[PDB]
Scaffold this motif. Structure first.
Motif, PDB file in Angstrom:
ATOM      1  N   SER A   1     -46.604  16.479   8.130  1.00  0.00           N
ATOM      2  CA  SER A   1     -45.617  15.603   8.760  1.00  0.00           C
ATOM      3  C   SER A   1     -44.270  15.538   8.037  1.00  0.00           C
ATOM      4  O   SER A   1     -43.336  14.933   8.574  1.00  0.00           O
ATOM      5  N   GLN A   2     -44.136  16.141   6.851  1.00  0.00           N
ATOM      6  CA  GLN A   2     -42.945  15.999   6.025  1.00  0.00           C
ATOM      7  C   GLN A   2     -42.425  17.317   5.471  1.00  0.00           C
ATOM      8  O   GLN A   2     -41.318  17.331   4.921  1.00  0.00           O
TER       9      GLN A   2
ATOM     10  N   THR B   1     -46.207  13.813  15.216  1.00  0.00           N
ATOM     11  CA  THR B   1     -44.909  13.976  14.552  1.00  0.00           C
ATOM     12  C   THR B   1     -44.679  15.413  14.073  1.00  0.00           C
ATOM     13  O   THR B   1     -44.277  15.670  12.936  1.00  0.00           O
ATOM     14  N   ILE B   2     -44.865  16.381  14.968  1.00  0.00           N
ATOM     15  CA  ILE B   2     -44.773  17.797  14.630  1.00  0.00           C
ATOM     16  C   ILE B   2     -43.758  18.524  15.510  1.00  0.00           C
ATOM     17  O   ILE B   2     -42.922  19.286  15.012  1.00  0.00           O
TER      18      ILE B   2
ATOM     19  N   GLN C   1     -40.268  17.771  14.486  1.00  0.00           N
ATOM     20  CA  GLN C   1     -39.871  18.550  13.325  1.00  0.00           C
ATOM     21  C   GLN C   1     -39.979  20.051  13.566  1.00  0.00           C
ATOM     22  O   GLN C   1     -39.466  20.829  12.754  1.00  0.00           O
TER      23      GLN C   1
END
Length: 205
Positions: free
Chosen positions: A84-85, A127-128, A131
């Motif tokens: 996620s980051q 949350t992919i 990004q």
């Protein structure tokens, strides 16, 4: 860095040679080191341990991805929680390590994300794709003419390794953007371009 890639490599080198290194057996080089990495991801997880060795300096391509599939069942450091980051932290800098290293980064994340686990439901895609698209308006334009575009080619098939049915639509405008940049730029073929429509003809809705 050198000692942690040795932690990989001596978990990938022994005297026997007729056995694998992603399933436990009393005598594999990986398996006790992955019981180790199991019991230390209970502490070492939030230390920023991930970007220290993704594209850092090595001289052995065999070592990379050797135990990425031996990243096994352990609960509190799941890579599906730990993805996620990495893309928002990679685009925290405006300009990546680029050039040929741009291809080694596209294929870094491609060879990393071919080792997504086979216990992957249709659930943890919160949350992919955001990004994704924060790099994918910039993904095809950095490739020069008649380059090694295979880093953008291979990445699609394990972008389809995800068993989902409901919210898989934001990747289609890459799937026509990357089915336009492959067509007009360099000499492409239909070897790895025809199975996608057939497999999304079989199992989707």
């Amino acid at each position: 860095l050198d000692i942690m890639q040795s932690v990989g490599r001596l978990a990938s080198s022994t005297t026997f040679s007729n056995q694998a290194e992603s399933m436990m057996v009393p005598g594999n080089a990986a398996g006790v080191a992955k019981q180790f990495l199991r019991c230390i991801f209970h502490q070492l997880a939030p230390n920023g341990i991930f970007p220290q060795l993704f594209q850092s300096t090595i001289k052995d391509g065999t070592f990379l991805r050797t135990l990425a599939s031996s990243l096994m069942d352990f609960n509190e450091l799941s890579s599906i929680a730990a993805l996620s980051q990495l893309l928002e932290g990679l685009n925290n800098k405006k300009n990546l390590p680029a050039g040929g290293a741009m291809i080694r980064c596209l294929e870094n994340i491609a060879t990393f994300m071919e080792a997504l686990p086979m216990d992957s439901p249709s659930s943890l895609w919160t949350t992919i794709s955001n990004q994704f698209q924060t790099f994918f308006a910039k993904l095809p334009c950095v490739l020069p003419l008649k380059c090694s575009l295979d880093s953008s080619l291979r990445i699609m098939i394990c972008l389809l390794k995800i068993p989902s049915t409901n919210a898989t639509r934001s990747l289609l405008e890459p799937f026509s953007k990357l089915l336009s940049f492959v067509i007009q730029n360099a000499v492409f073929t239909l070897a790895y371009l025809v199975e996608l429509c057939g497999l999304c003809y079989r199992a989707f809705t």
